[PDB]
Write a protein that binds this ligand. Structure first.
Ligand code: HEM
Ligand SMILES: O[C@H](C[C@H]1c2ccccc2-c2cncn21)C1CCCCC1
Length: 374
């Protein structure tokens, strides 16, 4: 793979994200690195409002621009939602909104915190010579003490990383159809299936590191956006950059490329059909790093893996293909059980129906791609 910013070890995750910005930006970093303290003491907003305007010119390399997106995105979430009890701000001040927006357009991303900010670039190893294991990793930024952001972000990232070993096989699949190399393709499909079955075990770590109460009542709040949100009905005013309010959705794993790229690979047309679910997933591509968007665009322009398998009358190939679809169905089914525990039941003490019907649509579409099954 080329300049699609895909890493052979960590996949769509940003490799070795840097922890520190230039000294020109310490006033940003001191805020972001102390969000728990400043929100609780009610000092955050005042200190945001006391900021001067830094130019984004001293952010020269891609890594530091990503880190700055993660810093200004967390600060914005904290500024907008405050202590997370519903007393919101509807105006982002000039002095953070301008640099945040100039940086976001520079990177072809919206000026709101997205998946690629707070998962893909929000991590580090404690010990660089150890393995990419939960025990040896940590997030860069959290919102509140006890918000379980570390567990939530890291377990997502560890799933993202487990998918990386299946991504590096994609080149093999397309090369094999182009060369009409059936046995080579069959093995490639089985290797992808195996990797997706291994990513299921990674999901099991969510239970040991995320608490439903804290997740539902705290973390969810700081991850909300201002699209179709009754609390900022017309959106957020990015003061000094746009005279008008604007709506952007909060962080959503529909912005993640790991599952979409396998949907594309397997010919699971998740974005066809006119439903709300297809609409949502297509909309969320604008919240992906443009290089990953372009990678997904490259997958779609390739010949259909599915139609190739269906056209060969080859039971071995159809079973290898179905192994991949079954593995995807298995992930989304377990994931649905997660949502039941972490959203549905906390909501009822001790809305979600729309969210789960979305996931259920995505799952059933996946399940309908199975072959000689029906
Ligand atoms: C407490 C744990 C979790 C909860 C409550 C949860 C909840 C949700 C919800 C409500 C959605 C639909 C809205 C959206 O797009 O974000 C969703 C989608 C999604 N989530 Fe999660 N999630 C959790 C953990 C994870 C983890 C660890 C991953 C690993 C990457 C993940 C991957 C995805 C993906 C790929 C989607 C897009 C839908 C699909 O492809 O089927 N989720 N999740
Ligand atoms: O699903 C998204 C959150 C999202 C997210 C944000 C940041 C990092 C990871 C993830 C994630 C993983 N699965 C869903 N999401 C919201 C949807 C509203 C309920 C609380 C979760």
């Amino acid at each position: 793979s080329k300049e699609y910013h895909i890493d052979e070890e960590v996949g769509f995750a940003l490799p070795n994200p840097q922890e520190n910005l230039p000294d020109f930006y310490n006033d940003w970093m001191f805020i972001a690195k102390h969000l728990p303290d400043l929100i609780e003491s009610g000092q955050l907003r005042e200190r945001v409002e006391k900021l001067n305007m830094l130019s984004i010119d001293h952010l020269t390399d891609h890594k530091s621009q990503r880190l700055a997106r993660l810093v200004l995105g967390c600060i914005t979430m904290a500024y907008v939602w405050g202590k997370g009890h519903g007393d919101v701000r509807k105006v982002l001040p000039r002095n953070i909104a301008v640099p945040y927006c100039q940086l976001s357009k520079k990177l072809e991303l919206p000026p709101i915190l997205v998946y690629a900010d707070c998962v893909l670039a929000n991590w580090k190893k404690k010990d660089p010579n150890k393995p990419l294991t939960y025990e040896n990793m940590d997030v860069l930024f959290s919102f509140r003490d006890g918000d379980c952001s570390k567990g939530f972000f890291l377990v997502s990232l560890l799933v993202e990383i487990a998918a990386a070993s299946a991504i590096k096989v994609i080149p093999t699949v397309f090369k094999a159809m182009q060369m009409q190399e059936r046995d080579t393709l069959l093995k490639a499909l089985l290797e992808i299936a195996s990797c997706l079955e291994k990513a299921l075990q990674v999901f099991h770590q969510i239970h040991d590191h995320v608490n439903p109460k804290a997740f539902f009542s705290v973390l969810r709040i700081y991850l909300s956006g201002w699209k179709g949100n009754p609390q900022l009905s017309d959106g957020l005013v990015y003061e000094g950059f746009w005279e008008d309010p604007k709506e952007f959705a909060g962080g959503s794993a529909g912005q993640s490329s790991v599952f979409q790229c396998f949907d594309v690979l397997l010919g699971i047309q998740q974005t066809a059909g006119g439903g709300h679910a297809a609409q949502f997933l297509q909309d969320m591509r604008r919240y992906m790093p443009p290089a990953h968007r372009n990678f997904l665009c490259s997958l779609e322009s390739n010949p259909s893996v599915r139609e190739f398998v269906l056209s060969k009358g080859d039971a071995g190939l159809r079973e290898a293909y179905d192994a991949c679809v079954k593995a995807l169905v298995s992930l989304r089914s377990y994931h649905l059980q997660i949502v039941t525990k972490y959203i549905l039941i906390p909501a009822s003490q001790q809305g979600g129906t729309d969210l789960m019907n979305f996931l259920k649509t995505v799952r059933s579409t996946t399940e309908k791609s199975l072959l000689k099954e029906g």
